[PDB]
């Protein structure tokens, strides 16, 4: 039964929202770049 569970399950954070939710993990960008400006001038909630 347990072998089957291993194989069955095997057959099944990975997005930006999951990153914004997690504050323990630290994320950053280049200091002077389109990425920082894009985040700064953005209007989306995430």
């Amino acid at each position: 039964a347990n072998l089957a569970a291993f194989l069955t399950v095997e057959r099944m954070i990975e997005s930006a929202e999951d990153l914004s939710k997690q504050t323990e993990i630290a994320y950053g960008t280049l200091d002077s770049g389109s990425t920082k400006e894009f985040f700064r001038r953005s209007k989306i909630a995430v």
């Binding site: 953005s42 209007k43 989306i44």
Partner: protein, 49 residues
């Protein structure tokens, strides 16, 4: 639906849809800036969705 067909493989070339105007139109200059302002605002993503 009906979903009677499918897309296969990858994109042969990459291009983009672009607003057009006749040579010397006064609209040409502002349409570029309008597109960039919409891109900053994220409007195009909302319309696409």
């Amino acid at each position: 639906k009906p979903c009677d067909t499918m897309k296969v493989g990858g994109n042969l070339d990459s291009k983009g849809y672009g607003i057009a105007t006749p040579k010397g139109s006064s609209l040409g200059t502002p349409v570029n800036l309008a597109v960039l302002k919409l891109s900053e605002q994220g409007v195009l993503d909302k319309l696409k969705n």
